[PDB]
Design a protein around this ligand. Structure first.
Ligand SMILES: Nc1ccc(C(=O)O)c(O)c1
Ligand SMILES: Nc1ccc(C(=O)O)c(O)c1
Lengths: 130, 130
């Protein structure tokens, strides 16, 4: 049971849970990843975004296109090139509600652990990913 | 810090470590995932294999093609269609040495935790992925 296999199994339980939590907001999981990462790291390559959402860059460009058409992401051409993609007010509010449902989805998956185990598990994750 | 982000960070530390451990054996990480999964679950869709190696199905078909050309995977046409892909003796021996270097790579990543924390962490992973 390589570590990476154990990690993959956890992601395989998490992802459909997160997707279903996000559905009533009209968002796919890739769209959520784009919103969240762009909210924290404005000006991010769609390659990086795609590696984080584990989708091809072409799929991410399609995500970007949909989020821009929706008024949640913009790239206003600088009257000074074009500005790196950032969230609008709309996108920030979207992002916030989506982060709330994703947090609840996470807690639902983490309920398989006791409260102390959840804290230790998140610490261990932080250490391993540092 | 959504759980999935913490998981992604851990995979982002693990993957280059595993890739470098596998390089002297002449294997990419996708090739390793194909070998290992085919060793345990003969007859597996290249879609499933690709989702586990987080590469596109086309990339996986290329992996399959290389592992077949190498004498590690076969698909002997049944004298009885074509048989589902399985490992040859060569592929099994390859798989075994590769599993050994991947295990050592894993332990190197897990050394950031004490021995008891590593045991508890693997238990927690098993529970969350069950
Ligand atoms: N980094 C990774 C990803 C997946 C696996 C896997 O065996 O499924 C791995 O051994 C390492
Ligand atoms: N299943 C996943 C994968 C990635 C993320 C992420 O925010 O990076 C997530 O929130 C859930």
């Amino acid at each position: 049971a390589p570590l990476g296999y154990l990690l993959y199994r956890v992601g395989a339980v998490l992802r459909p849970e997160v997707s279903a939590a996000l559905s009533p907001l009209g968002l796919t999981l890739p769209e959520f990843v784009c919103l969240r990462m762009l909210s924290q790291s404005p000006g991010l390559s769609s390659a990086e975004l795609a590696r984080h959402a584990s989708v091809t860059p072409q799929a991410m460009n399609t995500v970007l296109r949909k989020l821009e058409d929706a008024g949640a992401v913009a790239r206003p051409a600088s009257v000074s090139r074009s500005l790196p993609a950032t969230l609008t007010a709309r996108g920030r509010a979207l992002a916030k509600r989506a982060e709330a449902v994703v947090r609840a989805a996470d807690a639902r998956v983490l309920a398989r652990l006791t409260a102390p185990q959840q804290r230790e598990f998140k610490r261990m994750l932080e250490k391993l990913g540092s």
